[PDB]
Ligand binder design. Structure first.
Ligand SMILES: CCCc1cnn(O)c1[C@@H](N)C(=O)O
Length: 269
């Protein structure tokens, strides 16, 4: 069969590039992907490598598109956007990327088994002195004269988690919302942020490849639950079982571990 697949750029899980200007095609290991709004684009990365393996193992063809209506998935006044919205409203058969499994989402779409471990971590400059996410600097923040400056990228599972588990801290953080990881790290490297709270799998990767190894993460410890990325599918989808079996097979064949090495490794430790 042929599946429609929604995705979203977040390096290095999904990396988007123009087609090779010489051949006009997607060269190397990249695959064609178009925009939801619709210039030819190509996608590659850890999740794209997973997607290629699923299509070959299970035997489906697919067209892949980039979501423009929001990002991962947020429910605003009864309506979902992002990758979750695409699957929920049956515009796509599945969505794959750095898509975190949570309770709110699982209520409305099915997820595959998780294939990347994630959660919530905090990034700080290697210099900054702060304990972790238990710290009062984070929790009770207007309690300091020049308060700690820390933010996240809003509208994802991280912000949902914080606003739900730590409502007081959330109303403070909102001032320090960032549009993308790229901007957050820039602000963090410049003192405009003291800390950046974000998806663990992505943040841990950013630290591992930070130029000069000047940025480090601290783990949430007990402050936040461990979770995973999963492929989103229609509630009741016939595709969940075969996708699961394939993923479980990759996970024990050492194919996922290989992909981890390929995509997610860095020089800093
Ligand atoms: C644009 C938000 C990105 C983000 C922040 N936290 N988490 O978990 C995500 C994303 N992985 C998600 O699934 O919402």
């Amino acid at each position: 069969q042929h599946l429609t697949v929604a995705t979203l750029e977040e390096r290095p899980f999904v990396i988007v590039e123009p087609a090779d200007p010489i051949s006009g095609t997607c060269i190397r290991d990249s695959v064609p992907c178009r925009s939801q709004l619709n210039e030819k684009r190509c996608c590659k990365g850890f999740c794209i490598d997973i997607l290629k393996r699923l299509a070959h193992t299970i035997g489906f063809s697919y067209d892949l598109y980039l979501v423009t209506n929001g990002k991962h998935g947020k429910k605003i006044d009864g309506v979902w956007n992002g990758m979750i919205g695409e699957v929920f409203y049956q515009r796509a058969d599945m969505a794959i990327g750095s898509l975190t499994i949570n309770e709110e989402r699982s209520e409305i779409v099915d997820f595959s088994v998780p294939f990347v471990e994630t959660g919530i971590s905090v990034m700080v400059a290697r210099g900054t002195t702060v304990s972790g996410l238990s710290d009062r600097k984070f929790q009770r923040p207007q309690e300091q004269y020049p308060p700690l400056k820390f933010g996240t990228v809003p509208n994802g599972s991280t912000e949902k988690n914080i606003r739900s588990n730590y409502p007081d801290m959330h109303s403070y953080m909102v001032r320090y919302n960032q549009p993308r990881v790229e901007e957050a790290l820039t602000q963090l490297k410049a003192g405009k942020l003291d800390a950046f709270i974000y998806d663990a799998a992505v943040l841990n990767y950013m630290a591992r490849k930070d130029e000069g190894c000047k940025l480090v993460t601290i783990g949430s410890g007990k402050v936040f639950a461990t979770t995973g990325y999963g492929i989103a599918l229609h509630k009741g989808s016939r595709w969940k079982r075969p996708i699961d079996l394939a993923l479980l097979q990759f996970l024990g064949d050492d194919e996922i571990e290989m992909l981890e090495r390929l995509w997610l490794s860095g020089i800093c430790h």
